[PDB]
Amino acid sequence: DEHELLETAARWFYEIAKR
């Protein structure tokens, strides 16, 4: 599911950015 992959990458980037 490409949308799930993109959503997961986005969420992970967000969570990492928030420290």
Please identify which residue in the block is written with the tokens 């969570």.
15
Would you state the structure tokens that stand for residue 11, as one six-digit string? 């969420």
Determined by: X-ray
Rg (CA), the chain: 9
The CA distance from 13 to 11, in Å, is 5
The CA distance from 1 to 16, in Å, is 23
Show the DSSP H helices in 1-19 as ranges: 2-17
The CA distance from 9 to 4, in Å, is 9
